[PDB]
Design a protein around this ligand. Sequence first.
Ligand SMILES: NC(=O)c1ccc[n+]([C@@H]2O[C@H](COP(=O)([O-])OP(=O)(O)OC[C@H]3O[C@@H](n4cnc5c(N)ncnc54)[C@H](O)[C@@H]3O)[C@@H](O)[C@H]2O)c1
Ligand SMILES: NC(=O)c1ccc[n+]([C@@H]2O[C@H](COP(=O)([O-])OP(=O)(O)OC[C@H]3O[C@@H](n4cnc5c(N)ncnc54)[C@H](O)[C@@H]3O)[C@@H](O)[C@H]2O)c1
Ligand SMILES: NC(=O)c1ccc[n+]([C@@H]2O[C@H](COP(=O)([O-])OP(=O)(O)OC[C@H]3O[C@@H](n4cnc5c(N)ncnc54)[C@H](O)[C@@H]3O)[C@@H](O)[C@H]2O)c1
Ligand SMILES: NC(=O)c1ccc[n+]([C@@H]2O[C@H](COP(=O)([O-])OP(=O)(O)OC[C@H]3O[C@@H](n4cnc5c(N)ncnc54)[C@H](O)[C@@H]3O)[C@@H](O)[C@H]2O)c1
Ligand SMILES: [K+]
Ligand SMILES: [K+]
Lengths: 392, 392, 392, 392
Amino acid sequence: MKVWLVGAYGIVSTTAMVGARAIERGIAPKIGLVSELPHFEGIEKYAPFSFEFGGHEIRLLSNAYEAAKEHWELNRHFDREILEAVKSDLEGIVARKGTALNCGSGIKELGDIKTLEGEGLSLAEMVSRIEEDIKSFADDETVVINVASTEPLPNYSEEYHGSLEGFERMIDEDRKEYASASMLYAYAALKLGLPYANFTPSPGSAIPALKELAEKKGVPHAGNDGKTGETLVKTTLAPMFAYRNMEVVGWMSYNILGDYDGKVLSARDNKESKVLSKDKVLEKMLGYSPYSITEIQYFPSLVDNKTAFDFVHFKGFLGKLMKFYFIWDAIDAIVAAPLILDIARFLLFAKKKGVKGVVKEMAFFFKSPMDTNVINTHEQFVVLKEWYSNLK
Amino acid sequence: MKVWLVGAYGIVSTTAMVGARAIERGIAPKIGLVSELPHFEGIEKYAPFSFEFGGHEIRLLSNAYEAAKEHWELNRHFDREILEAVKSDLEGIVARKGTALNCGSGIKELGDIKTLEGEGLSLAEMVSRIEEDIKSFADDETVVINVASTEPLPNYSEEYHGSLEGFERMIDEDRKEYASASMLYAYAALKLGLPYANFTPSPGSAIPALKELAEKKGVPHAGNDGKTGETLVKTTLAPMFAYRNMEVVGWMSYNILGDYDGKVLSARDNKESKVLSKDKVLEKMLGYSPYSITEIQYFPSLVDNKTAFDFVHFKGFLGKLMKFYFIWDAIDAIVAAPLILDIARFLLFAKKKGVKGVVKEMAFFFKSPMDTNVINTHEQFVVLKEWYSNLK
Amino acid sequence: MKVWLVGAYGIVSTTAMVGARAIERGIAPKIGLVSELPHFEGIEKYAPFSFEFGGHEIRLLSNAYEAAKEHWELNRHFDREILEAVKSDLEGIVARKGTALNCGSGIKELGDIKTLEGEGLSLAEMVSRIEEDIKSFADDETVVINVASTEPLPNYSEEYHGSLEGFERMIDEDRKEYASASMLYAYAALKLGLPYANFTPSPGSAIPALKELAEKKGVPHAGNDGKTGETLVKTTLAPMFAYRNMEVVGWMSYNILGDYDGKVLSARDNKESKVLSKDKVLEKMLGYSPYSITEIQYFPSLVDNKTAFDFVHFKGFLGKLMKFYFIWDAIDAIVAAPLILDIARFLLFAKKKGVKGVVKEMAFFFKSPMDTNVINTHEQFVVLKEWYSNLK
Amino acid sequence: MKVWLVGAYGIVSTTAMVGARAIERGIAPKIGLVSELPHFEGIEKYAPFSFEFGGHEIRLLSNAYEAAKEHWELNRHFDREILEAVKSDLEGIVARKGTALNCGSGIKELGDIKTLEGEGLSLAEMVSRIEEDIKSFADDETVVINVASTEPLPNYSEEYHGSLEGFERMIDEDRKEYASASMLYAYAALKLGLPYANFTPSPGSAIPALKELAEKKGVPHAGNDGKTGETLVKTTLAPMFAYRNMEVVGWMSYNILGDYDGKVLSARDNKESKVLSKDKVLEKMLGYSPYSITEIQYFPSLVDNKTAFDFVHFKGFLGKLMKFYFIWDAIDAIVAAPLILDIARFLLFAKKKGVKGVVKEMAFFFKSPMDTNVINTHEQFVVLKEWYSNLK
Ligand SMILES: NC(=O)c1ccc[n+]([C@@H]2O[C@H](COP(=O)([O-])OP(=O)(O)OC[C@H]3O[C@@H](n4cnc5c(N)ncnc54)[C@H](O)[C@@H]3O)[C@@H](O)[C@H]2O)c1
Ligand SMILES: NC(=O)c1ccc[n+]([C@@H]2O[C@H](COP(=O)([O-])OP(=O)(O)OC[C@H]3O[C@@H](n4cnc5c(N)ncnc54)[C@H](O)[C@@H]3O)[C@@H](O)[C@H]2O)c1
Ligand SMILES: NC(=O)c1ccc[n+]([C@@H]2O[C@H](COP(=O)([O-])OP(=O)(O)OC[C@H]3O[C@@H](n4cnc5c(N)ncnc54)[C@H](O)[C@@H]3O)[C@@H](O)[C@H]2O)c1
Ligand SMILES: NC(=O)c1ccc[n+]([C@@H]2O[C@H](COP(=O)([O-])OP(=O)(O)OC[C@H]3O[C@@H](n4cnc5c(N)ncnc54)[C@H](O)[C@@H]3O)[C@@H](O)[C@H]2O)c1
Ligand SMILES: [K+]
Ligand SMILES: [K+]
């Protein structure tokens, strides 16, 4: 199948790409792949484990391997043997000039940046470019996944964001104001009849406009922020107290990271996005709002080794307060990189099973699920499970 | 409803007894009460929150206020203000001499408190008086909960505990060695047709003999080792890793504390039982067996402050290892106590719905679920929600 | 001896008060007291354990005990017996209406409080009044200490703070724009030839203009900002790396609490002073500046149980990266309180040994030691051991 | 300078060998070296940085290079490319068959490997071979260091271990029952006018028979258990509540690993030796003997990356108990490796300065230091400073 990646040079895109061909070459085991669990067997008939990549990007590199070798020097999240060996497959992957419209002043790492608006461009011609780039790559088994970096919180207007006739006029009114980059991608792909997936905390297809579109064109889309490590753990441990009819007092979340992602989440603009999702998760799991603290600080030495520090203050039986801590220590590119593949694969399956509109049974992967207030891990996982069952 | 408690002076028995009144008295919230959760609405038409207690005990102390007193001063797990408002009551509840038998090794610190073995009553005699105080205690709504010390691995008899003739023959042929104090209390309770629950890792009513002596009497019994906190977290977070298809390479479980629990668990006799119960757990939650280490250690200064250090070493995409920690800091007696009243309330209802034999669907409370393989908390929680549902 | 405490009603203050009588009487041990370490044996002939109390307050309570209860009733930071024993003494202690000149944004409560600054007073009639309660109270063996709410970064004016005649001028000039609370407290005591010390990060006597008026008066003042919890460990553990020639790439520091302490140190004004002492420490111990983050966040669940989480990322041989974690779990008031009485006897003894001005040999108690660069805890502990001996 | 290493095919020997070459090539930094700290400037006059490597191994292979590569294979504790660079050098390092006369009865790999002690040779017959391997390599700049597998306690005698004559007689009297493998090396070093160092919890030259051997042999020696991971932290943080007169109630030391160190320490007679130095620490530093548990457990998945879990339960002012945690995440090999050089260099210095017998001032490198009680890390460091200055 073919995958069209946004921000195709990121640590997670290339972990994907390196991963996919490592397994295809029967080199790498398939650990992490949710699509490979014993409950979804048979999925190879509609979504076999075979991949073809391409996509947009705004970082100036040669191809996809030279972007993959870069992040590896910093983190080395996989042995040098798997990279050299997949060095060839990716020398042919070459991202194309994309757009970065309204994505925070937390952006600065490319002296060269004459990209979309860089070239004195219009909404119209920008959309035509992106459309023309996915178009020439896309086939019948193609999926578009946003994996670029955290954008700020755009200001929704129901005029240009609340009716496909609006957003389409927003493009004709050259309204670069309300237009965000992650909307152009979703609109691009949903337009082209391709299934879309948003791993990032950006709105993307998460607007009324770009909901009316898929549904009107029969496209099953899904997302709103990979739930890959910390938040996984909190959406898995919080209901534990609701089951034991204890009350939580305060939850503290504290995360420190330093590569391109930690780099952009530095400011309180774009960072302000993703922070939210990992905060609000808790109300909708308990039915009460404990005092919650969630912060993400820069920490250059860890690079992609996202570390997270949690403490939960909880009360039981006789009014007592008690205490629970956990430290998460992993490399984001490892817990996220399969998800990008599981997603493509469930989305391809969905497409073929006549699934259109949003896939609220894919909540399992995301921390801001569209059209659902299912946050509990084993409960999302059951819904994910009972969905497939019902379509097999 | 009434509740007989073997181990009447324990910190869990008094703290259950302390809260029971303090709530019925209106001087305490209903925090931590699983049967108080909105789901189980209307169970109070069968078992309303109203208790009266009594029980067996080897540590001879004056009344019930005294014991609770003794524990509040080491642990202070609630307010002394409550201590004295629960004064009159617990002054009232007086324990009865029970039996200690062929198993316990750390089960001796209350000096020459020798009772049954010190002199020489007969097996059938103790069981006679044992059933005496109970029988005389019981009534319509009596539930027999064993919340006493933990005995070691019960040297099982294929000729004695394999059938009712057996146990009834041992009990007559005075086969004292294959006999343990808790098999006893479970025999009397059941033989009187009163529901039974094993909050310890002790055999209790796990043998065939007693099971078949429960089936025949039409009585419901169900439990084995309350599932309180560390282990409670081990079966809520373990399925995480499985949900996402990660391998689990090692789990470290190190527990510390030393009131009366950590005391007897200085010896590996009755210590083995409890620990084994937290370890085997992992296997059936993910199908494979990671290298496991589980240890309980005497730390007197923490007393009931059961504190735990756990660590999960797991493998992701491409084989990268990743690390995960958590520490648990609390009083076993406050997170234990409301699961004594819950089970009792739960054990009544089931009775008045016609239930008999091992309530397999009550596994949600114990780490050693009788007659079932469902260890996952969310699996157990849903089950329970259901088993009530069909019996409503 | 006699002791005046700015902010007599705070939690530290009364934990020093309560403990004092608790120990004067014989109903508590002297554990945690530094002047009771063998080395300083013979200090009692100069500063024996016996205390008389007074202070200033802007949070009018009827008496010290009344303030001892609210901090206790939320924190239960010591036995109820100790309090019950002391209540009668603390009830006899009454705070005198204090100043709040330039106390940044955090001092929200009194709202409309009138009796000192707010009572239409000038700075002249003000400064004298603060000198008229410590005039009357104080004798020959009195000493002044600041354990008040933290004060924001003081806008430094070299005219009125760089000269003693300037600060005088400041007074009849009603120069409240350069005047802050501590400064006038610290100005009065020193006026009075009364030894003075500062437990808060506030400038207090840490201006040129006061170092002069003290030496010109012949009085020994001390420190700045008490070093009670996490910077204690920092200035203890960091050199471990320096002595082992490893390099610190980054240090995380995160603290949470939620009482008055938390309250005012919830805003940028006040809390900026605290952080900087905390964080800055690192620079002076290893001789290099690694990446370091120091934060404080308002957790209204812990209160004075301030909890801190630290992360150290270090390199050794061959450039390999390594990590070390730690969590600080203790009551602030309790690790602070003994310090107060120590600083008291260590001040009189200076007074009694002739010493005037900054006693930079008491660096050991603080985060920002006045006039010195000894920040290593064992360094400042030898120093202070040296200093007693020489004056001895 | 020459350095002969017992247990030369170990990850720690190998790491110092790799890091040595690397550094002398100007291609590897100087981090981790105590001897390269400014204070010790001029050290270069007697013991520059250049090493010549040889040593004894009982698991003889082709060279040091394939042993280093093996270790690297699993641990990956340094840049792949450094081993290539150094490769040709270690390749030309071929240890010889050492000997493990009495290591208990718990090894698992050296199987058929024994051209030495396992070839039918007397005590006297093995020494003269062992003494013949180090001489052939030795000069006047050569030193012998012990970094072999840990050993259980030995069967001491007042006749064989209490005198070099009584000892010597034990060698040509075939009393193999007393002859430790370590003593046979240290004895071989020292009896050649060569300095020795013991980085293990194993005996070595720490018996009166050999302590006296170096006095008359006019050779300095030192060590017994190089203090690296956790225990460095212990003797560095424990003094902290001393200075503040706080009381240490209990300390918990929980270490997990799994290489040839972890593999060997399986049993406890072996484990006896190590945990001892990992326990006696606290009493010898505080004056207090708190409740201490020091434990070490296998966990194959961590290989060399030893992981320590410690907890301190400490009492404060008005009896307040409070807690302190921390986690040591790091690689054993890497922190210990540079110490081997250091110890080596500081051993050369002491020989040129006429120092014979134990070098008590070298105590800063060890957790079991000979002939002194100074355990304190800051105390051991200063003591190393002045010892060198004195000899400067
Ligand atoms: N565990 C995790 O990895 C995880 C989990 C949840 C969310 N996420 C989110 O995934 C996203 C990407 O993660 P990452 O670690 O790979 O960060 P990254 O910055 O390394 O990858 C972003 C890549 O996209 C490029 N890019 C940025 N804006 C773009 C645009 N408008 N058009 C095209 N390319 C653009 C960037 O220059 C870079 O090449 C972030 O939003 C992050 O918050 C990651
Ligand atoms: N969170 C927890 O407390 C929890 C969870 C899992 C299992 N358990 C098990 O439940 C038990 C009780 O816990 P605890 O903290 O109150 O221990 P405890 O020592 O405080 O109380 C045990 C009580 O049982 C009494 N007893 C012991 N043997 C007896 C006998 N033969 N007959 C009558 N009385 C007897 C003891 O003297 C004491 O009064 C232990 O066996 C423990 O292993 C506890
Ligand atoms: N471990 C700690 O508790 C600790 C450690 C080091 C430094 N500090 C700092 O020292 C102070 C004492 O801490 P705390 O927890 O006791 O806070 P606190 O609020 O309990 O004590 C402050 C007290 O001083 C009073 N006060 C404040 N400003 C005043 C003024 N201008 N005049 C008169 N009274 C005034 C307050 O109303 C209150 O009674 C804080 O500034 C804190 O930042 C605290
Ligand atoms: N952080 C540190 O690494 C640390 C700290 C304290 C102590 N130590 C000690 O240093 C030593 C080396 O550590 P390692 O982790 O590299 O272990 P390692 O097992 O990988 O290396 C030990 C080596 O000694 C060899 N050996 C064992 N018995 C021998 C004998 N009789 N004669 C000759 N060679 C023999 C083994 O074959 C092996 O190559 C161990 O005793 C360890 O406990 C290391
Ligand atoms: K990432
Ligand atoms: K090691």
